[PDB]
Amino acid sequence: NEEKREELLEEAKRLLEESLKLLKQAYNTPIEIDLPISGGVKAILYNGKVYLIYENGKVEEIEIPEDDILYPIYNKYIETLKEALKTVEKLQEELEELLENLSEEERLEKLKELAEELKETAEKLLKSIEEFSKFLEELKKKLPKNIKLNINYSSINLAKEAAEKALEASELLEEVYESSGS
């Protein structure tokens, strides 16, 4: 049955690599929003900064006051993504060290710890994603019928797929832990 455990562990490692990749891509991917009644201006959200890019090619970095409704939600999303990136990289390093390596029961405990932290991080990320998506959908509802907002959900979908892959890896690690501790 150790071969089954090996298959599950390597699948979890693969899913963790994929999760880290998708998380870095999501952090790199900016949130684009074609602002309305502005002469085809696009509001780009990148690294906690807001940029207006005009059709002619002008780009202005606009500082958003801490009081606007968008700043807190977007910053919470950014910070959750950043913290998830750090946590996932830490857990990846720990799982690699585990696979390389003392005490089988301690390794079972370590796998349980890894999976629990992975699950918590994935669920917090999904929670932040849901909050930000609800905010954006309400923002688009607060608009006239003719006026339409075209948002590029690339980063949000990347983050959601990454959180789901992390959850899958966590549940695979949990299967390993259960089938081994018993």
Numbering used by the authors: 1 to 101, 107 to 187
List sentences quoted exactly from the publication behind this structure.
Here we use a robust deep learning pipeline to design complex folds and soluble analogues of integral membrane proteins. Unique membrane topologies, such as those from G-protein-coupled receptors, are not found in the soluble proteome, and we demonstrate that their structural features can be recapitulated in solution. Biophysical analyses demonstrate the high thermal stability of the designs, and experimental structures show remarkable design accuracy. The soluble analogues were functionalized with native structural motifs, as a proof of concept for bringing membrane protein functions to the soluble proteome, potentially enabling new approaches in drug discovery.
We started by designing soluble analogues of the claudin fold, a class of proteins involved in the formation of tight junctions, which are critical in controlling the flow of molecules between layers of epithelial and endothelial cells. Claudin folds are composed of an α/β mixed secondary structure in which there are four transmembrane α-helices and an extracellular β-sheet. We tested 13 designs for the claudin-like fold (CLF), of which ten were found to be expressed in soluble form. Five designs were further biochemically characterized; three were monomers in solution according to size-exclusion chromatography with multi-angle light scattering (SEC–MALS) and were folded, with two showing a melting temperature (Tm) above 90 °C. The CLF designs showed sequence identity below 13% relative to the native fold and nearest e-values to natural sequences below 0.063. The CLF design series showed that our approach could be used successfully to design soluble analogues of membrane proteins with simple membrane-spanning topologies such as four-helix bundles. To assess the design accuracy, we attempted to crystallize the soluble analogues of membrane topologies and obtained high-resolution X-ray structures for one claudin, one rhomboid protease and two GPCR designed folds. The CLF_4 structure exhibited exceptional design precision in both backbone and side chains, as indicated by an r.m.s.d.Cα of 0.73 Å and r.m.s.d.fa of 1.28 Å. Comparison between CLF_4 and the native claudin demonstrated accurate secondary structural element positioning, with an r.m.s.d.Cα of 3.63 Å and most of the deviation arising from the β-sheet region. In addition, the four helices were mostly hydrophilic, as evidenced by the low lipophilicity potential on the surface.
